[PDB]
Amino acid sequence: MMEQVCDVFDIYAICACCKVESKNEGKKNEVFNNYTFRGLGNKGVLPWKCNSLDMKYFRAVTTYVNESKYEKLKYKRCKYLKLQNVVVMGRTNWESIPKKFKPLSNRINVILSRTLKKEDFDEDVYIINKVEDLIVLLGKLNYYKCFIIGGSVVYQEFLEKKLIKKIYFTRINSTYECDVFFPEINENEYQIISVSDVYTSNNTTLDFIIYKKTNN
Amino acid sequence: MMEQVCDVFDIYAICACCKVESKNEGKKNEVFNNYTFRGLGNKGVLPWKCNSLDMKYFRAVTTYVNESKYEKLKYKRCKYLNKETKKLQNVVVMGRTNWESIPKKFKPLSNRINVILSRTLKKEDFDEDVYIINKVEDLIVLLGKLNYYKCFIIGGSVVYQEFLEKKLIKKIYFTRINSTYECDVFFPEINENEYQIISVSDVYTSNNTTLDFIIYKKTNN
Amino acid sequence: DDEEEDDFVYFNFNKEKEEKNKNSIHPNDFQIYNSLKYKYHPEYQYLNIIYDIMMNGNKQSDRTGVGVLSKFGYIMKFDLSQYFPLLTTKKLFLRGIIEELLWFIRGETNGNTLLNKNVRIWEANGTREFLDNRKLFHREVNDLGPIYGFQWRHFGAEYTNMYDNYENKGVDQLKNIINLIKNDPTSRRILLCAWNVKDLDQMALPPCHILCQFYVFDGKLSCIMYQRSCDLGLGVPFNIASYSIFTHMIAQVCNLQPAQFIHVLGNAHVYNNHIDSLKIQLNRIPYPFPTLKLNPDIKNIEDFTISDFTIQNYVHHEKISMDMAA
Amino acid sequence: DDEEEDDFVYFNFNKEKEEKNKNSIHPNDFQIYNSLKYKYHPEYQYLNIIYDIMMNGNKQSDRTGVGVLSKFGYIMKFDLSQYFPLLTTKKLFLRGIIEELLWFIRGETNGNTLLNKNVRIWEANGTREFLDNRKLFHREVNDLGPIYGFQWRHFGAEYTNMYDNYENKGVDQLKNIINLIKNDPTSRRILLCAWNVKDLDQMALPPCHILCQFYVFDGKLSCIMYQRSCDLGLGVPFNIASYSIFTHMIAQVCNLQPAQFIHVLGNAHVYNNHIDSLKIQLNRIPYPFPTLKLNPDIKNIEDFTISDFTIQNYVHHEKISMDMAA
């Protein structure tokens, strides 16, 4: 019996957070926990500028599609109301993406705004006035999975309203200057179901963990 | 697709075979191959008496059933027969001599639907809860009317030979008893072009002999 | 498709239905550990062994009256090129084990040197009572005998006392394996062995770390360390760090990049007293590993000093005392 | 659950796509080996290593000119209570390794003894030329030096020549490990080590088999053997047999039942010249292992003779010349 959108319509969140620096004492925290990793961006950009391994991960996850498993989805979705995934982002977020890289290739780019002119951009490039308007654009489109790629503001509301199924969280294990952060995930609403191998990229170790919606 | 009986009804064969007593001819530079393991029985019984581990394996395989996978098999068998719309058990088919070789305390085989192939005997000759059929065709008819998980052909040689002849075996669970005993009945030589080994188990020791279990599967074309 | 799936069940026909001391370990207990679908973080190589010993270990009682769960033969591998394997499911300190390493390199066997730096790893092994019980009635307190350092720099030399000048006596294996790595890298004899059969009875105690074997490929160094006895809950965590650090050191003085530290465990055991703590540890999710930075100017194995080692970005769960006794 | 499956797809995002020597090796070559679904026969522990080395091994020139494919660190386990692991994918004879073993146990280092029994395992290492090139100019032909036999019974004694009676000189490790297994079974110091650092240069060649460690639990004896250098195509098959027999011998004279023989491989290599032959072997399906029977009246490790050993029901494939050179 299918009516809780997140699970229902297949919405996922994907992020990469680093550690935050505090002016009073910058390192070697006395107490650590999952919240340690919350740095999201700094002055319109990533706090660590670039990380090719995470870039590859982000791209591979948002563009991956398994067509044979698409009607198990077309089925209930229709039943509830060149396959590509949907990538929902914010304006400040969309404006941070470089020129040559916009829109994100092989992905149905969506945007959350109150001032952007739909009139102005492409059709394969949709915009929306509010959260709830997204569910709508989904019921019309043909996609595999919907990924909320940020930013902070966008992560927060999507979590509060409880639309997030899984959170593909990348832990950048180094400290940087930050001004925007990810919302403290509620350990009782979401739980870590997977932890990857550890890697070194751009002079920092990092790993990828998967947060799940405790169906419970 | 042209549906073959062995697939629709899941007819499998399971046996145990030891090494035969050779007329060592003056060569302990013996050649070995899969046919080296062909001894099925001796004077009505197993060449090796008993093997608790093989026994345990035979029982686990022939009594194992997965109810969640039944409905899928049901729709398939019924679809093939153009027929569409209390515990689940497997079937075991054996020759009359195999039947008679079983101790009374063990007949019919527990938790399995027992089917016996014979001409000299009829339902009236048996006290047990078993099915008596006098031809292979009767089995197929019987399987289309019963609720069962899988069908295992358990011997003897004669029974094995014709089921392989008729090309009704989907897979062969073969136990290689790594020892030599006196034998008078043997398992048919498997045509390597018709059957290929797809799995090999761990090696074990039981009743003073090592043994392992392999699985043959009907081939391409 | 499912065709070969039932075959899996048949091949497991002779398997034990339940885990051995599952009865004593109890699963609601490891409920986060069992809730994980994919545990690819390297720390699980260590955690999975703790789980394996707890669930299938053999109950044994040391001649001490103490109890343990033990298994025989395990192997862990850590990619030092991607991370420094310092356990993150509990808090670990490294000053002491680094000093112990520097002490081995100097060839010392003098227990006082470490005590004066408050590194008490070997203290209990050097007391008057412990040496007497080893029948070392004529050994001075804290004179550990021909252990590691002596074997690494003077194998074969006749041990006298911890203050003797053994300059040029015995085989300097440390110097030899380094020269082998530099001149003959494809050699399969680059071993550093501390188990000197002739000197065992003279040692405060036989070495736990039997030997190190090195492998060199495409400018990269790997190391295998064979441990004959492993205290999983307390010792192994430090064991992995020590030898991972050693690997980096040997690699840098030979201008090679570190590759894998391969840990081979012989008698792997878990003390019964650590079980509650280890259960707690098993339910913690590892954080990304930290990295190790060595002062790049050090090019001679003997020139390292405590200030040349730096652990960076160490994120960890709070400390746990394996023995919750006090 | 199917996306708990997609996560799997993601986690594997940083692979290469092909194995290293794919192009060089070609898989339509391991057709039979790859067609199998469940390869649980213990012989696959050895065949999978060969396949791993061939597919992922590093290319090196092991001894000047020869060239091999190598890997570092592997562990194989054989349940001696369930079978004797003599490889069946090719033919093997054990008279020679058993004589070598007895030779070891007697503490001999005289190559002529083996040669008189038509066992040439050590012939090449005892020639005038081989010895001279090892710088052993004052060593008689076939006097192998302080190798296995000598170390097992007299570790630490000064080696003189192969005819010398070294009575009550050095450490008789062999006897000591037998007494520890009998009187102190739980000990984690039951090691037999042949790698005598001080005597290496005096040996025809350093031991390939570094040490053996024993483990006792509930009347069962397990043994781990650490091999520093391993010739997968020619040596290993025999090494596994050699030590499994030794494990049985020690178990019997100690009144225990043999359990597991654990083989640890340090530098594991496959000689290029053996590739073609090993490709053939990998496409052969194993036969159930045979069994080993020792004369039950032998109660002292020193009392075994060649006729006290019988390998039974050995079913094997055609013998193979690893080196197809003519």
Ligand SMILES: NC(=O)C1=CN([C@@H]2O[C@H](COP(=O)(O)OP(=O)(O)OC[C@H]3O[C@@H](n4cnc5c(N)ncnc54)[C@H](OP(=O)(O)O)[C@@H]3O)[C@@H](O)[C@H]2O)C=CC1
């Ligand atoms: N490390 C990571 O994984 C990520 C880092 N970042 C970093 O964070 C920074 C941007 O963060 P942040 O400030 O959170 O903002 P975002 O860029 O995510 O979004 C800001 C915009 O979202 C729109 N918006 C907010 N609420 C709604 C709503 N209810 N309906 C429709 N539109 C809405 C607004 O549009 P308008 O004003 O027209 O109304 C607003 O300007 C950048 O530096 C970026 O690089 C971002 C994502 C991920």
Ligand SMILES: NC(=O)C1=CN([C@@H]2O[C@H](COP(=O)(O)OP(=O)(O)OC[C@H]3O[C@@H](n4cnc5c(N)ncnc54)[C@H](OP(=O)(O)O)[C@@H]3O)[C@@H](O)[C@H]2O)C=CC1
């Ligand atoms: N180790 C192992 O895995 C196995 C060992 N064995 C051993 O072999 C012996 C049995 O050998 P064997 O005599 O070759 O064979 P079977 O037990 O197969 O008996 C065949 C005989 O059974 C009946 N039969 C066979 N096919 C048909 C048919 N199509 N229609 C009607 N009746 C049929 C007939 O009985 P009737 O004469 O009444 O007409 C026929 O004479 C035993 O010693 C047994 O233990 C058997 C199987 C497996």
Ligand SMILES: O=c1ccn([C@H]2C[C@H](O)[C@@H](COP(=O)(O)O)O2)c(=O)[nH]1
């Ligand atoms: O660096 C070390 C030193 C010691 N031990 C442990 C193993 C054993 O529990 C004990 C040594 O005693 P024996 O095993 O030798 O009896 O110390 C370790 O795990 N790591």
Ligand SMILES: O=c1ccn([C@H]2C[C@H](O)[C@@H](COP(=O)(O)O)O2)c(=O)[nH]1
């Ligand atoms: O019982 C034996 C003796 C030798 N070798 C092999 C290992 C090497 O291929 C070669 C010796 O060369 P070094 O590893 O010592 O360099 O002999 C074995 O595998 N088993």
Ligand SMILES: CCc1nc(N)nc(N)c1-c1ccc(Cl)cc1
């Ligand atoms: C490579 C950055 C990246 N890594 C991960 N793991 N998650 C993300 N959501 C982003 C991302 C951030 C900002 C924009 Cl604008 C687009 C994508």
Ligand SMILES: CCc1nc(N)nc(N)c1-c1ccc(Cl)cc1
């Ligand atoms: C335990 C013997 C056994 N083991 C295996 N692997 N398969 C078999 N088919 C039998 C068997 C033989 C004769 C009778 Cl009568 C019943 C079963």
